[model samples]
Target: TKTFKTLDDFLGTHFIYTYDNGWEYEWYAKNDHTVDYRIHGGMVAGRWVTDQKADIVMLTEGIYKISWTSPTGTDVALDFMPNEKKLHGTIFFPKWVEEHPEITVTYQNEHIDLMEQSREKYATYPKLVVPEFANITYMGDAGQNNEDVISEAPYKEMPNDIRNGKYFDQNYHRL
Candidate 1:
């Protein structure tokens, strides 16, 4: 049985959203509220805010501003439902609209386990080694203070989805 841990407890764990081409969008959650969103080549530094809303964890890369309002309709943010372990997001920045425009987050820890077992089930196939994890901000709660400890923050506010010279492929997998 999956123990019921607060959504906060789920942070700092590893999770992957595998695409149709078997590419993994692996994300590591840091308690400090910042996240390291990794693809194959580079990493997208992001932040996770409490959102003041229960259960819905908000992650974004400064998603930028549209009319000085929420970027909800834009494909610049990720809405994660921790209980469901799914992410609803879109890359609708007039860039990949011709191809797929959205991602249906699904792969979880259990799915990764299956991927590993199948590799060794009969052929003893090698377990794929993920790329070196990129370093970014690590966050944690500052204890009930309306404030949280956001360490590793900007090398110093963050603006629009920050990318490190890495772009996306047809499958929206970072390259």
Candidate 2:
């Protein structure tokens, strides 16, 4: 058995590479304080986002429960045990299910490269810019000239992808 001496040892990005239905997901656990926290995740290739705010309740060494809530009025309670390289837990979605099967989440490190690639290939868009501050430039298309807009719009850069909605919305930050 592995034990974490401090909560910080248990906090960071975690990735669940497999799910019940071949679904992939990643979770980001933000540490605000000793007892305050927020965790959010969704399908890595889909759009089902889970936004949750949680509080830590320690039951014993290496064991704890996180009481969490969603913006959609769903309550989640998760029982977790810390390991050296992963966090294992059973998450219950009271609004949806009586209990969820056990899940193991490994620490996310190299997986960040995948996220960066996805952002670049599917989320980034080019736009004409103007300097709103001394040296800072604002990148946007809202007030651009028609010619510039036509030339610099994301659709023009990736016509097929944009037409098919294959590009991910960079502003979709829920997950």
Local accuracy of candidate 2 as per-residue lDDT tens digits, 23-42: 32233343422122212222
> What TM-score fits each model?
0.31, 0.36
Any idea what lDDT model 2 has? 0.32
RMSD of each: 18.1, 20.2
lDDT of 1 at 147: 21
**Model 1 whole-model lDDT (C-alpha atoms):** 0.31
lDDT of 1 by residue, 91-140 (tens): 33222111221221112222445433433343322222222222222222
Question: Highest TM-score, which number?
Answer: 2
